[PDB]
Amino acid sequence: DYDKIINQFGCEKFNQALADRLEKLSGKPAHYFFRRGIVFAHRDFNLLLDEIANNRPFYLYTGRGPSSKTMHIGHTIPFLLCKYMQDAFKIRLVIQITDDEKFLWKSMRLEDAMAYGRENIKDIVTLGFDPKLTYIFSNVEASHHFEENILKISKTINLNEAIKVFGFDMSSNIGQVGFPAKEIAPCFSSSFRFIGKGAMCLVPAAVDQDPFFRLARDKAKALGEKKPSSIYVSLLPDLKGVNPNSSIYLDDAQDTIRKKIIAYAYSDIDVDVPFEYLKYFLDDDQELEKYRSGYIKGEITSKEMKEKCVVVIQEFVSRYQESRKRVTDDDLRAFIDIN
Amino acid sequence: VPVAIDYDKIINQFGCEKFNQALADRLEKLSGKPAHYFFRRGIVFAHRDFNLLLDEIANNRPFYLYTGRGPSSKTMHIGHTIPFLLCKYMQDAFKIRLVIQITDDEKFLWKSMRLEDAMAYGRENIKDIVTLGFDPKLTYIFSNVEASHHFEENILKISKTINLNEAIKVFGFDMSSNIGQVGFPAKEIAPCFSSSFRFIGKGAMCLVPAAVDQDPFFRLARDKAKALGEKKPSSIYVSLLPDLKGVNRKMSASDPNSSIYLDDAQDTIRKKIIAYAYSGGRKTGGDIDVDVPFEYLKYFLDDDQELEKYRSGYIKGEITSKEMKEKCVVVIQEFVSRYQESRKRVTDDDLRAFIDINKF
Ligand SMILES: N[C@@H](Cc1c[nH]c2ccccc12)C(=O)O
Ligand SMILES: N[C@@H](Cc1c[nH]c2ccccc12)C(=O)O
Ligand SMILES: [K+]
Ligand SMILES: [K+]
């Protein structure tokens, strides 16, 4: 229930007026995420759209927390949204890899969290962001470049707030408690040398990242910075239709994919996982529409739905692996270089 | 109580060991050279595991010193020089490394200050410290803001081992504390571990000369040593020089008029001491135990026999309070003057050598 999720976090409901505006402003149709309700919520997107209308530049900011097995396809969603956004407005993108957060939260040696951090970057670079417009960084290694901001953010946030907003308690470690300043800092242009002096930030994130951003927004004025704007993506469910072997991984083979879908995909179009997967990955609106119409009229079977989902997901992973196989460890360096 | 302090109540309220003359003797044998007068005159009163640091030395194992200063807007008073003098000595006696954390972060995080200022003040305090004349080849002085990231791993590892329950019980944090403050003790703890500095031997033991008010950081550091696979730091504690009325053995300054500052003119030093220094003298021997001028000498008179001569003479009424004050004036005066002429000669080249982690 998406209205209840919006109510709990207290952000705004996304709407199609905002998609039209974005389409109008980009001279190209809004990415289908905005059209299919995958982007369902926001804070101040209108204001970021106003920034584009006034031909002022904005920049994107998103993050990823390590915890490596291979990444699955659900993990690509905000990053795809950033790719489209970068390619539409040829704008800069900063990606935070939270090796520190994963270390501080999970039972994990730091070297491993950092090691997973690097693979996640290789995996993320795969989606083909512009190296001249994208800065991806490890927190452990590189959040000190905006140390001043971290301190400044940290000073404005008392434990009272930290607890209420994040649910810390007497057993939270003092790293966890300090960490939100490191997630908030990249929300401000002053955090990066390579970004214009008062560029607005746009933060595409799982809705569940919101508290960082309501908070960042509350402290912006006190810090003399522009309020970031944010947009939220629904989370792709696993194939059973929920949140192990029923996720679709980025290193799954073509046959592994056809297996997982035929076996586990729950098959009434509001409950149908194969359609839902299609909502997220099938490029063609006229095509997707055929299947929504088709299943609804009973002119298409669950067998056919599964199988169209199969080939679409197969087209996606195959594109991904074709690029992945070619990401050299040299290529990784262009993205993490600050200088 | 002007000079006299119940050192044992201070030692018990913290959980540390008391210093003894056995440890100074051990220090003499091991360095060949005599033990710094700090160790002989009661100024090093408490410690944790100094016997073990001595055992490291005796075992041809290296150690390093670590100490700190939070920068302030204000000129620091001569009291502030005490643990840094102890380091200068320890460094020269063992030709060992020293790391000095300037906590511009802490001062920013705790005070009503722009970060820019804390950092500026930090940079002045590095000039202030270098003045005391350390070995450029063995001393790393750094700002936390610029430089603590070279040990962000240790900060992160340390941060994992300290929960809020503990952070509060130990440091007195509350709901109105900011989250920078709460995380800060990991940053003070980190330099206790040789791995926090690339240029120090794999597992060299740390020795922290400190005000006892700093113990909680080190008790905690020692508690997390095993957790981190690191050697427990040793710690020795200095009794703080009192103000001229005695009493305020705070690193913080009470009534400026009753403290001697590193920028006081010679006549101010005389005026201040003669006017406000509380004396042991009787109405009409002398009461050494409360005599503030003698206490100052205990801290600053680099000559043992001359100290003994004033002590003796005082106890048997052979020396007057005016005379004790007088000698106290000359000693403080010379110390401040040598300090000030040294400050002038400190170039930025001097400074840049102390500041650069690449030197080692
Ligand atoms: N903490 C997030 C990662 C992250 C950091 N910064 C972000 C900004 C936007 C979205 C996500 C992030 C996670 O565990 O996944
Ligand atoms: N909290 C200390 C600063 C400090 C950091 N590390 C230290 C090590 C030793 C002594 C003091 C310090 C102070 O303001 O005094
Ligand atoms: K900037
Ligand atoms: K080391």
Author numbering:
A (entry chain B): 24 to 266, 274 to 297, 312 to 383
B (entry chain A): 19 to 302, 310 to 385
From the paper:
First, the aaRS combines the specific amino acid with adenosine-5′-triphosphate (ATP) to produce an activated aminoacyl-adenylate intermediate which reacts with the appropriate tRNA to produce the aminoacylated tRNA. In general, aaRSs are divided into two classes based on the global fold and sequence conservation. Crystal structures were determined for a CysRS from Borrelia burgdorferi bound to AMP, GluRS from Borrelia burgdorferi and Burkholderia thailandensis bound to glutamic acid, a TrpRS from the eukaryotic pathogen Encephalitozoon cuniculi bound to tryptophan, a HisRS from Burkholderia thailandensis bound to histidine, and a LysRS from Burkholderia thailandensis bound to lysine.
We solved a 2.6 Å resolution crystal structure of TrpRS, a class 1c aaRS, from the eukaryotic pathogen E. cuniculi with its cognate amino acid L-tryptophan. The E. cuniculi TrpRS structure was solved during the second round of crystallization trials for this target, as detailed above. The sequence homology between the E. cuniculi and human proteins are 46% identical and 65% similar amino acids. For example, in the E. cuniculi TrpRS crystal structure the three residues that make hydrogen bonds with the cognate amino acid, Glu124, Gln119, and Tyr84, overlay almost exactly with the human structures homologous residues. Any compound that would have selectivity between these two proteins would need to utilize more than just these three amino acids in the aminoacyl binding pocket to gain selectivity. Differences, especially just outside the aminoacyl binding pocket, need to be taken advantage of when trying to gain selectivity with a molecular probe compound or potential lead compound.
